[PDB]
Amino acid sequence: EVKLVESGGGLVQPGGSLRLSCAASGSIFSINTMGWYRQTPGKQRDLVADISSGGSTKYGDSVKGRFTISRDNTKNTVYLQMNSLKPEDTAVYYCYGLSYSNDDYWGQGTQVTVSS
Amino acid sequence: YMLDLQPETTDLGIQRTPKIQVYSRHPAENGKSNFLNCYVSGFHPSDIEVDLLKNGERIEKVEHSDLSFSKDWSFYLLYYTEFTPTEKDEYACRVNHVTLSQPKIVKWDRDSGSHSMRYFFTSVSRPGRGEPRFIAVGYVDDTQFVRFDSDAASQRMEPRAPWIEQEGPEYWDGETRKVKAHSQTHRVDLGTLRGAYNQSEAGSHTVQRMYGCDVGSDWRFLRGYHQYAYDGKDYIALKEDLRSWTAADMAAQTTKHKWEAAHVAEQLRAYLEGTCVEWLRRYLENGKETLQRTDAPKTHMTHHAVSDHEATLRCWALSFYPAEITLTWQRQTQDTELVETRPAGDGTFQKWAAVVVPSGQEQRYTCHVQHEGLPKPLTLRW
């Protein structure tokens, strides 16, 4: 029903930055919370940052202070400013969204690599 | 009242996915204050991230119970919050765990006897994050009454039941001293078991410890336990006779001989056969209004059409204590859904059984409710 378009990944030097963007399709009333998870070396994915349509934010402990999520509520699009990137931040970052009925939608992901 | 052994006495010489349930404490009513619960159980290891969602966004003030585990060493937790449900609002629970490739979402579908005292201890190593996480809880039957969390600010053993708050400073100073010794034991055993299994110093591991005593309706000693587990698997345990040990692998055999030569079992036997039951009797008397009560199940039935031909009948049982209960459908051990008993958050428990019956044959099915708080077993029908 809902599609998530992701952009802004790629290669970056240590200490550099990157701005991820995620846009949801459909009606503006189709999506509330939007954010990012990132793939761990193992099976699971870990919370990076998410934001509600009202602006309430939550960050994972690994990215507190360096990462910042913002929202453009006229187009249901969120942005993730990733500062001070380290090799430990290298992963596939999945955009996700929650419908107002608690239905979750997941994007294909964007690879992020931090050099040595 | 915990064990009080010297620290050197008890020195030492599998991943499960959580089951999830979302429900309210009481039947949902418009404008009536309630509590939204998310009960995760049967998972290992203990690290888990549980969120409560309202209309597709996180609920801020969410509380959870203290970490405990069952007989198979799998953990269980209850996440809850106070809420007033209205017409439009929708609720769910999101759980993340090492066994899940992505967080799982479960929506809130709005439409005389024996006694025991238990103590559970969990220690999880945190390489580089600091000292291991230590959590200890005490139970009298299905009621938690004390707690300790190494990450809490008090660094004290804290009451979790009204009848234990009567105890004086000598009691709480002693329990705080004993629970810190339990933590130091697990702290050393984590470094010991790591090298005993040739594991790296960068991974996280878990040590679990359980002991307690059972008494009959005459409050006389029945059985005692003292079990130890490493990473969710049995390590060493005290036999029912309380004088011999049951070890699993080779490293546990080494601990078995060091404990046999130091006569550890006799010190444990004296506590379980004497001290454990003595203070269990004191708790049962001091909390007689709570621990010796028998709350009868408040029952009712619901009917939900599934395919306009087959219809689902659900037998409910709510607000009952203790947790032991039997629910059966009589036309039938097949095509009958029986859910796990779950805590309500106020000391009571819940359970329901379901039966898919053909439309028109509703009055040909009966539900039987067997509870020790019920004089005569109830029989319910639509």
Side-chain angles (χ1 to χ4, degrees), chain A residues 2 4-74 76-114, chain B residues 1-5 7 9-10 12-13 15 17-18 20-29 31 33-59 62-70 72-81 83-86 89-110 113 115-128 130 132-169 171-183 185-200 202-222 224-232 234-239 241-242 245-257 259-265 267-288 290-293 295-297 299-303 305 311-327 329 338-354 358-360 362 365-369 371-375 377-378:
Chain A
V2 180
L4 299 170
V5 186
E6 302 149 272
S7 71
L11 177 89
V12 71
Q13 273 186 108
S17 61
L18 253 178
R19 201 227 205 172
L20 302 187
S21 100
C22 187
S25 69
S27 175
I28 180 89
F29 305 106
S30 298
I31 293 292
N32 185 351
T33 295
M34 284 176 79
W36 276 272
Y37 282 67
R38 69 178 183 188
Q39 187 65 54
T40 77
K43 192 182 186 149
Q44 85 184 286
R45 56 189 71 183
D46 277 330
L47 168 74
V48 175
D50 54 17
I51 185 167
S52 66
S53 88
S56 301
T57 67
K58 176 118 181 273
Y59 297 94
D61 284 7
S62 286
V63 308
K64 278 256 181 204
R66 300 147 63 235
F67 288 19
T68 292
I69 188 166
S70 56
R71 190 157 177 157
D72 177 70
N73 265 302
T74 162
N76 253 353
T77 296
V78 299
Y79 309 95
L80 182 65
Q81 270 281 12
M82 307 159 82
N83 297 353
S84 211
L85 281 159
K86 310 137 173 23
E88 304 83 65
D89 294 338
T90 293
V92 178
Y93 285 72
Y94 305 102
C95 174
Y96 92 104
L98 291 178
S99 88
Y100 284 93
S101 301
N102 302 306
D103 285 302
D104 59 324
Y105 307 103
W106 291 91
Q108 261 225 318
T110 60
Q111 176 73 237
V112 170
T113 293
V114 190
Chain B
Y1 205 85
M2 305 185 222
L3 187 66
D4 199 1
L5 310 183
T9 306
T10 45
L12 264 49
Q15 285 187 338
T17 301
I20 306 150
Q21 290 199 63
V22 194
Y23 53 92
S24 48
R25 181 180 290 175
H26 314 303
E29 294 174 357
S33 196
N34 202 333
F35 285 85
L36 176 66
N37 298 329
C38 186
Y39 178 69
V40 292
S41 71
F43 58 100
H44 196 99
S46 63
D47 284 335
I48 195 168
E49 199 183 56
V50 178
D51 289 307
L52 295 185
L53 303 176
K54 178 191 181 190
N55 302 323
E57 95 175 53
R58 205 184 264 95
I59 298 169
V62 173
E63 289 174 281
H64 62 113
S65 64
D66 295 306
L67 187 62
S68 180
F69 51 90
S70 307
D72 59 12
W73 305 105
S74 77
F75 299 96
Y76 65 88
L77 283 158
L78 178 70
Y79 285 74
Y80 58 96
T81 192
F83 79 126
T84 307
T86 69
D89 303 344
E90 275 164 289
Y91 299 84
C93 183
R94 184 176 50 190
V95 176
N96 205 6
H97 191 252
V98 73
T99 60
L100 297 170
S101 49
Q102 69 194 52
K104 194 174 284 177
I105 301 191
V106 176
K107 319 176 149 271
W108 177 42
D109 195 4
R110 193 159 62 188
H115 297 279
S116 61
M117 179 171 72
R118 291 276 126 71
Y119 277 98
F120 304 86
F121 307 89
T122 308
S123 284
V124 186
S125 57
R126 293 183 288 196
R133 183 78 180 283
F134 175 72
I135 284 165
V137 303
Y139 277 89
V140 173
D141 303 329
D142 303 310
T143 307
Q144 155 174 2
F145 71 106
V146 282
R147 100 148 177 149
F148 183 90
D149 196 339
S150 58
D151 285 23
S154 69
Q155 296 294 300
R156 303 276 293 171
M157 193 90 189
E158 296 175 292
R160 283 290 181 261
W163 46 269
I164 201 75
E165 290 172 2
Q166 322 174 183
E167 298 291 336
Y171 177 88
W172 296 110
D173 291 337
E175 300 308 302
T176 305
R177 167 183 62 80
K178 290 189 285 195
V179 81
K180 285 193 225 113
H182 283 69
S183 177
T185 305
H186 284 30
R187 200 169 100 91
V188 169
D189 296 4
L190 278 165
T192 292
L193 289 159
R194 178 146 64 43
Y197 284 96
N198 200 45
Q199 292 159 344
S200 61
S204 171
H205 296 274
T206 310
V207 164
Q208 284 165 279
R209 191 179 178 182
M210 198 282 302
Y211 63 74
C213 56
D214 300 346
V215 300
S217 58
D218 59 343
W219 293 9
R220 284 169 236 220
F221 170 87
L222 282 200
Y225 325 80
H226 190 280
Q227 285 160 321
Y228 216 86
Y230 189 51
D231 288 334
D234 286 322
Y235 182 79
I236 194 166
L238 200 66
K239 314 197 118 142
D241 76 66
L242 311 174
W245 297 98
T246 311
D249 51 338
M250 314 336 150
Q253 230 62 22
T254 305
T255 292
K256 189 174 136 283
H257 300 316
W259 284 7
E260 260 154 350
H263 294 262
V264 164
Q267 290 158 270
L268 298 172
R269 179 187 227 250
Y271 166 87
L272 298 162
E273 275 181 1
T275 311
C276 184
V277 359
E278 165 57 38
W279 285 85
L280 177 55
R281 301 185 173 139
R282 298 189 187 184
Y283 297 155
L284 289 163
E285 168 63 33
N286 294 347
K288 64 206 145 273
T290 295
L291 302 168
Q292 292 184 64
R293 85 200 193 280
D295 285 0
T299 43
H300 63 117
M301 189 154 312
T302 57
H303 186 334
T312 298
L313 275 274
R314 182 167 270 112
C315 201
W316 284 92
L318 303 168
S319 190
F320 65 95
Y321 182 92
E324 175 66 10
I325 175 144
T326 325
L327 304 160
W329 274 107
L338 190 51
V339 86
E340 180 190 339
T341 310
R342 61 206 199 191
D346 59 352
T348 62
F349 291 87
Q350 301 178 354
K351 200 182 186 86
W352 59 257
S359 286
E362 284 91 18
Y365 285 77
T366 72
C367 158
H368 301 301
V369 180
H371 189 247
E372 96 174 40
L374 285 178
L378 291 172

